[PDB]
């Protein structure tokens, strides 16, 4: 929540350089408040579809109920941090991050009024621009993002505020440590959902991811086309494992994330989202030791399209080299050090810095 | 020349709404440069520099956006078109009153499209 003050009568005239800046700055604040009020008035295809912010938005609907803001507003009267029990029974962290009401009501307007809409101290106008700036940028973000943003910017939630959110969340000490050392990822997996400007308070819901599975082993499967090496142009056959992507052990099964680009890797930790996963038996790993094993039917696609390509892996490069394409691996100090023969071959990242397949 | 909003007929025949959203030329030519030269090329009022930094700031932020977007942006940011300007554009557009009300209550969606 950000607490605002209603500005009733802006009766300032007088074209004076110092006066004009406060009047124009006050119009920015009023317009921003008004602007926010007008706002209320392969194998990826197997995956299901969720409603990413259904949880956060549902909390937002509860805040529109009668008296729901007064509970929040009264609980955040003495401190900037309080746990509020909502009408539906849900306990929610509340957080007053910016108090513009008291600044305008008790510090700015008295100073402003005293000298007949004239301010004899440039420092007071600037201090207001600094105070006002955050509310202006929150409005700026919500107006181009249609009231739901991701990632949660440092304007919506400063770094220190977010760390305080994490330390007060009902989660494990292991969980808190994980989120705290990776705030850049936590932001990227978070939503900020604008909510209400009711009473004298602006409130938005920040929907943070909670990581219920931590420290289980994960592996990334890279796959590439495997073709015959016949001399006749179209006499060739091709075969590719399609089960490429990320795999993590999870509650006795294996969570499979087909689109590996939706996962973020920081050092050796993989942050994935289970809404983009299929739940598979542990026996999926057998496809790596014996593709013809009888316990799991390993997925593949077949083609007659023998085109050359390369797949960069975590520790090397798979090279599918077919036809007359030139495929090599190079060192920074030595040039070309390996020329690939036709078929699927592999190179480690030890002696190799680049891999060249055709004009790529 | 006289107003900040006008309807212009182009050479090919299509009439297009026009809109002067920022007049930095006149600010510099008539208000800043005259103040500057008079007091022996020095400015004795800190409020004058800030007023210029504020007028200039939008032109700078527009430049940042076209410089990172190669001259075509979406959605239309509030630096390109402030909320009041966009509401004025919709209201002055040759469209239905059902259409104007729709666009005006959903400007955030009008930006995104």
């Amino acid at each position: 929540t950000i607490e605002l003050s209603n500005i009733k009568e802006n009766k300032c005239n007088g074209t004076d350089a110092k006066v004009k800046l406060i009047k124009q700055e006050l119009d920015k604040y009023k317009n921003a408040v008004t602007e926010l009020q007008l706002l209320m008035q392969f194998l990826g295809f197997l995956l299901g579809v969720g409603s990413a912010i259904a949880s956060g938005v549902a909390v937002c609907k509860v805040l529109h109920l009668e008296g729901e803001v007064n509970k929040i507003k009264s609980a955040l009267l003495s401190t900037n941090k309080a746990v509020v029990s909502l009408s539906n029974g849900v306990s929610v962290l509340t957080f007053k991050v910016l108090d513009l009401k008291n600044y305008i009501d008790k510090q700015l307007l008295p100073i402003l009024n005293k000298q007949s809409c004239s301010i004899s101290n440039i420092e007071t106008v600037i201090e207001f621009q600094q105070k006002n700036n955050r509310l202006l940028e929150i409005t700026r973000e919500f107006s181009v993002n249609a009231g739901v943003t991701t990632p949660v910017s440092t304007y919506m939630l400063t770094n220190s505020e977010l760390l305080s959110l994490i330390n007060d969340m009902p989660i494990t000490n292991d969980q808190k440590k994980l989120m705290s050392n990776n705030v850049q990822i936590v932001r990227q997996q978070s939503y900020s959902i604008m909510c209400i400007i009711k009473e004298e308070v602006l409130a938005y819901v920040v929907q943070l991811p909670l990581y219920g599975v931590i420290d289980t082993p994960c592996w990334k499967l890279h796959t590439s086309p495997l073709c015959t090496t016949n001399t006749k142009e179209g006499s060739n056959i091709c075969l590719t494992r399609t089960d490429r992507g990320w795999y993590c052990d999870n509650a006795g099964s294996v969570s499979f994330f087909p689109q590996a680009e939706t996962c973020k890797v920081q050092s050796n930790r993989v942050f994935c989202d289970t809404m983009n996963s299929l739940t598979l038996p542990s026996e999926v790993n057998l496809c790596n030791v014996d593709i013809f094993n009888p316990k799991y039917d390993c997925k593949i696609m077949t083609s007659k399209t023998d085109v050359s390509s390369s797949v960069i892996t975590s520790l090397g490069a798979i090279v599918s080299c077919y036809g007359k394409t030139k495929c090599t691996a190079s060192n920074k100090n030595r040039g070309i050090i390996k020329t690939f023969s036709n078929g699927c071959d592999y190179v480690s990242n030890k002696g190799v810095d680049t891999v060249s397949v055709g004009n790529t | 020349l006289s107003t900040n909003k006008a309807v212009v007929s182009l050479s090919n025949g299509v009439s297009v709404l026009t809109f002067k959203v920022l007049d930095l030329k006149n600010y510099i030519d008539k208000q800043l440069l005259p103040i500057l030269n008079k007091q022996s090329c020095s400015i004795s009022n800190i409020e004058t520099v800030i007023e210029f930094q504020q007028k200039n700031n939008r032109l700078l932020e527009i430049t940042r956006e076209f410089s990172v977007n190669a001259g075509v942006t979406t959605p239309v940011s509030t630096y390109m078109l402030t909320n009041s300007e966009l509401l004025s554009l919709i209201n002055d557009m040759p469209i239905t009153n059902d259409q104007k009300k729709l666009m005006s209550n959903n400007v955030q969606i009008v930006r995104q499209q």
Partner: antibody
Amino acid sequence: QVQLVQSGAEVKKPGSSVMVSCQASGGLLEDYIINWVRQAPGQGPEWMGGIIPVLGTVHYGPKFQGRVTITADESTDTAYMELSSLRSEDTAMYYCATETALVVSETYLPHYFDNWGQGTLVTVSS
Amino acid sequence: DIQMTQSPSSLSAAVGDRVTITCQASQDIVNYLNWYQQKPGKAPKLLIYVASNLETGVPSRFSGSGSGTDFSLTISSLQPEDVATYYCQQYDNLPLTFGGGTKVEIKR
């Protein structure tokens, strides 16, 4: 503290032309907008025109255009104003007045008059 | 041309009185407005430029105000040496124009 020193007062017959000079002492003409402002008896001052040597631009009022020529001879720091086809209305005090023009943009126009000459009283009479 | 309408045409006030002069333009001229003081027989003197900036060495009892179409010149404590004709002058567009003048007389 540039001083503007104008030519002497004189009488000119109707229909001929008059040239008023304005001597800048202490500065160059490149550094200023040089304006000419006249004042007829019992009337306010009237802007006749201005020259901006640093921009190579001359501007004349509609009431005088086509019968006023303003020149700036930068070799002697003297401003000149020729007013042809004199009439009785032209009997007036003709003032040379400059505006400091160091930081200049294109499309720069005269704005104010911060330093004035003493005035040249031209009487148009036979 | 832009017409400057200055009011009043003349006024008489005692030494120490507060005096205000009005300047109006025929159209919006933002705050591109100057004020001049002319004593009889002498050149005009620039008092106020760009609507409100005080020229160097002019006593602080002079002030300039206004924007848009309506402007004012305020003297907070009139002194004998202020007897003169005052002119406002706009520069929003050419040709530059002056007001009609306000003659200020001292009542003693």
